[PDB]
């Protein structure tokens, strides 16, 4: 069956056009709605269609966010179209997104099943691209709130990583409360466990640190069996937070007395042959104090990514690395002078 719809381009102009697609199949289902895979009739290009129930009287948070973003490390919104929801206010919003065949989750699972660690060059490549996508979204005040390997899409040949699923994302505004029960448990920042509602985009940096640690370990670093058990898992590594760290996580939370537990050494958390720069980076992301975590741009400039800035760098398959230095004024806005460190001499315009 060939489906023809009138759809609006994702970036702009707001001028609708006929879009035809075929080979429709369900590739995901959840509370949010349904995700389909389809093929565009014009170009033969594969797309993902996310279908969500929408309130007519309200703007869709996910669409608003998606229409703003144009970055090589974020799944592009090609088109969007509305479909009839039967009920007066109920309509369905359909997001036509670029299809990406793999995930960091599946790639890491493959290596984990084979009892081998993902090669360090891919850990550098995937993590660097994730930090770039985070630097970009955070510059608009957008927090993803669901950073996990499953939401990190991969083109297996080019090693291009694209951040997906903006279903939990929100444009954070200081002084406007946010829900504390957010994120996929294993990747949930400790301030969220402590019930903070005044949190920042640094919760995504905690989650990025969890992804990194997982790529190094071959399993999640903090596999909590519940919300309370999630903190138990964190304490086994970080030890107990100090009175100052508690205040920094949630100033509305007070705990009179508690037994103090020392941190477990980072070098013992990981396997002996773990690259020390990867452990060092990880120690600067998985911090109780949210403001002490590296910003995504600071993480991109970390010495762990120095190999990516080498002019002679190549993928193990022999191909060139994807675009790594095409930074924009928007992406560099949090710290513009950092550009001269992030953009190596060989990458600069002739």
């Amino acid at each position: 069956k060939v489906t023809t719809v009138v759809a609006t381009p994702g970036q702009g102009p707001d001028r609708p056009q006929e879009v035809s697609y075929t080979d429709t199949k369900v590739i995901g289902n959840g509370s949010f709605g349904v995700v389909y895979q389809a093929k565009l009739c014009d170009s033969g290009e594969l797309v993902a269609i996310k279908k969500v129930l929408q309130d007519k009287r309200f703007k869709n948070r996910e669409l608003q966010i998606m229409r703003k973003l144009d970055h090589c490390n974020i799944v592009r919104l090609r088109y969007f179209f509305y479909s009839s929801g039967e009920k007066k206010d109920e309509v369905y919003l359909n997001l036509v997104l670029d299809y990406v065949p793999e995930t960091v989750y599946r790639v890491a699972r493959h290596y984990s099943r084979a009892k081998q660690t993902l090669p360090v060059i891919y850990v550098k490549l995937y993590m660097y691209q994730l930090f770039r996508s985070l630097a970009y979204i955070h510059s608009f005040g957008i927090c993803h709130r669901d950073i996990k390997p499953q939401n990190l899409l991969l083109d297996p040949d080019t090693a291009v990583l694209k951040l997906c699923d903006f279903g939990s994302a929100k444009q954070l505004v200081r002084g406007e409360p946010n829900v504390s029960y957010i994120c996929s448990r294993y990747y949930r920042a400790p301030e969220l466990i402590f019930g903070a509602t005044d949190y920042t985009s640094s919760i995504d940096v905690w989650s990025a640190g969890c992804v990194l640690a997982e790529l190094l370990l071959g399993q999640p670093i903090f596999p909590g069996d519940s919300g309370v058990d999630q903190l138990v898992e964190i304490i086994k590594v970080l030890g107990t937070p100090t009175r100052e760290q508690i205040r920094e996580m949630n100033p509305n939370y007070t705990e009179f007395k508690f037994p103090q537990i020392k941190a477990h050494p980072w070098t013992k958390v990981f396997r002996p042959r773990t690259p020390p720069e990867a452990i060092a980076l990880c120690s600067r992301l998985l911090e109780y104090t949210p403001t002490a975590r590296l910003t995504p741009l600071e993480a991109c400039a970390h010495s762990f990514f120095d190999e990516l800035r080498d002019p002679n760098v190549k993928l193990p398959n022999g191909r060139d690395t994807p675009a790594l230095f095409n930074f924009t004024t928007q992406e560099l806005s949090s710290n513009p002078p950092l550009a001269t460190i992030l953009i190596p001499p060989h990458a600069r315009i002739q």
Binding site: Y181, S226, V228, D229, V232, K236, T240, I246, Y253, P259
Partner: peptide
Amino acid sequence: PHRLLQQLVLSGNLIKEAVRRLHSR
């Protein structure tokens, strides 16, 4: 469950209980 965490947060007993659960196993 989720009710337990909310209660621990409101009562200010979250760290004490997490430390107890660590030692319990």
